[PDB]
Each structure stands twice: as structure tokens, then as C-alpha cells.
Amino acid sequence: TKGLVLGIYSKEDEPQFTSAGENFNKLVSGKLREILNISGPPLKAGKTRTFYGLHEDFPSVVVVGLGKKTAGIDEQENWHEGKENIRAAVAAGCRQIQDLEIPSVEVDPCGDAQAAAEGAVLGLYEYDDLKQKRKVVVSAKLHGSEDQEAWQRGVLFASGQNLARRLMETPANEMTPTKFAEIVEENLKSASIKTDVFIRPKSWIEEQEMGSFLSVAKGSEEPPVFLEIHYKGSPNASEPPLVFVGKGITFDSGGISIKAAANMDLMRADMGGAATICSAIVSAAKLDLPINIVGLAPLCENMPSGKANKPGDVVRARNGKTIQVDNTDAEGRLILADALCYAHTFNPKVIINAATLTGAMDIALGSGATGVFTNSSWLWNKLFEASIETGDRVWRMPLFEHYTRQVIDCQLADVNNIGKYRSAGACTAAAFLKEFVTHPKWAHLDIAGVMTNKDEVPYLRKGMAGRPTRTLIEFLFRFSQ
């Protein structure tokens, strides 16, 4: 009927199968082991081989190379390596079944059902909705009955990420401020009725004196929205929450400090800060974690017009500070000035904001790990340890006064929204946000280098990666335990 993804490790005397693979070989009376031998060189990790008609039920059987059985935490790479081996291997195996146009697959748990489910649900995702020319939708299920809640924990974690990838990948004319708030809203309520959504309009934002955010949204005719999500997971309702904040620019053209044409279409994903944190709240609520979490996301477009922000303008943040808006394409800073002052209202335990903030983070680490600026090494350590697990790596960046300085010397105002130099572009923008944060446990995750995948993360196809939504979910899980 269907397909079957099966694993095997690198040599012992004979490279060894997963116990599911060994079982299946016994079931077809040694025929898998035999056809593997006839097919030639052994399967190294991530690689694939397909075998036809070994069993009446699995006419296509894909054997995937899982590398070393005992691969664990790598000190150099800072991740569990086995989990990463398995994500890439069952992603590759699953896409081979899909190219065979087979609608269903049974996936080998590979000794870690959670990492097996993450490779298949992440590796098979595309965002197909607007092409009439689509791939067969395959349905991936666990090959077995034994480790079920781990496999479904993987399905949970990976679907939390794929929500983010879909929120990001959708063209900005469909994923506007209102549309984004409405999809997150429904996704949060289906996850738990211990939720409340507030899709706050322009009049509220005005009443909230969020003039820095309003200054950015004015150039467009698309209405701003301030999204506020609550997941009431603690037994006591009066437990202080963990707050998440995210940049929600649904399209960044730069405005009057207009962007170059080349590849500005990827700016439809400049709400990836709001996608990532909102997907993790949806997944925390699905996981029904015993914690209270608020989700905050300013959503607007940044367009040029006869009423847009002009370079040089001084706008007042909620907290009374004035910002000189020297460059209109440093709008995340602005939107986040106001949303971060608002987070202190909730009396948080932790404030975590995420944002596709600077191209300089991309030049920096950009691609291999998201940069996290934190005044809390406790919080740094928490995110970093969750990162080992998920494999969706995080790397620390300096939150030194030296950078504050380059943003504090300012002609008309209290803070300038851009530094005098090109140097340390992501550290200066981090210094701008700290100006709007008094909290002792604050992390700023600059997600701009991890916005996209090409080939680097094996189990993700080309397009918006939804990174780092799983490191964020893992952090909340561990924080709740």
C-alpha cells in the first residue's frame, strides 16, 4: 500500500539495522540484508537507497544511513549529533517516498521517535497552497506502536515550526497584519481553551502611546495590529508570566530609506520574529505546559508614501524617550521599542524578543546559529542547552555599553535608531533595544541569518526556515519542569 523508511548504522561486522529494520529483514526472510549487499557500497549518514517489492505491503522500502549508533553531544558543534543524524536521514527517506508519489509512509523510530518525527514532518513540508502544480501529500506515521508519545512530541515540535514557516513564506499581500493575527488566534485556541486573544487595533495602540510603532505603520494603508496572546497554563493564575515579543513587519521595503530591488521579496518574512514566538506559544499550549506565557507582536508594513516616516524625524516611545529615525529601514528597532516597554506591564519572569533585525547578523554568524544578546547568563545558558537538544543552534553576542554609546550620541534625541558606523551592526541594534528594557532576564534573539534555508539544514527544504521555533518550545518545556 505504502512506503517504509528504515534505518541502518555504519559498520560493526555488518553495519547494523535499527531493531525495526532487523525485524523487517527477518519478515522478508533476509531479503533486505541481501539486496543491500548486492547494491554495493554501505550507506553513510544522510544517504538513501530504495528497494522495490520486498514485501507485499511496502513495495518501496527506503533504507536511510543513520551514521554512528552512539553519536551524542559534540563539543565542537554544540548539538546532539545522533538527533541531527536522524532528522536528516528520515527527511531524505521521506522525500524519496514522495517522489515515488506514494501517499503514506511508515517511518522507523530510529531509537529516537521524536527526532524521527521531526525529520519527516520538517523534511516533507513545502507551502504549496498557491501553486496548482503540487507534490503528493504524504501521510507520515510511526512504524510501530511502542514509542508513541515521543513520535507525537516530534510531530508537535515540527508542526510548531512549520506554522512559523507558513506564516513567513506566505506573500505579504495575503499575510497582512489582520491575517497574521487571525491565523495565530485560531491556532492558539485549537491548542487550548486556556487562552485569550486580543487583536488590538490602531486606536488602542494610539491610546497606548506607542508612537514609535505608529510612526512606522503610517506610510502604508494596511492597518496596524498589536497582537496580544495569553496562555494560562499555571495552576495559580497569579503566577508571573514568561513574556515573548516579536517583530511583525509583514513586508519591509525600507520605506523612504528604500531597499534595493534584488531579492526584496524575502522581506515578506520580516514578521519572522512574530511567527517564531507565536508558534512556540501555540506549541506550549498544545504541549499544555504548566506555565503562564504572554505573546506580544506589533504588526505593520513598512512602505514609502506621501505620509511615511522621513529620515531625521523624532518620535516618542511609550516610555517617553525620543528616537531620531535617521534611517527608515531600521523599523524593527522602533516597533520593538514600544512592544518591549509594554512587556514590563505584565510583570514578567523573563522577556524574550525575537527579530529578523539586521543583515549584519547574517554577515556575522548568519546562517549557522541565531544570535542571542542577553543580560542574563542564566537565560543564555537555558536557551543554549535547549539548542543542543533541538539542534537549532543559538550563539551569544555582546551586550556591552560600548555599543550603547554609538546609539546614545544623538543630535536631536535620546536615542538614534542607527549607529554612526557599519561596525558591529547587530550589537548596536541590540544596544538600542536595551534602552527600552529595565528587566534582569532579557534575551534578544536576532533571527535574520536563519530566516531562510537553502541546503544547510538537511531536513528543511528551500525557503523560510521558521528558526528557531523548536529551541524556544524546548526552553519552555524545560523551564516548566
Binding site: 513587519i249 524575502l266 520580516d270 529601514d329 531600521a330 524593527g332 539586521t358 543583515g359
Partner: peptide, 4 residues
């Protein structure tokens, strides 16, 4: 996204 500014550039650099």
C-alpha cells in the same frame, strides 16, 4: 531587515 537594515544592511551591513
Amino acid at each position: 531587515x537594515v544592511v551591513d
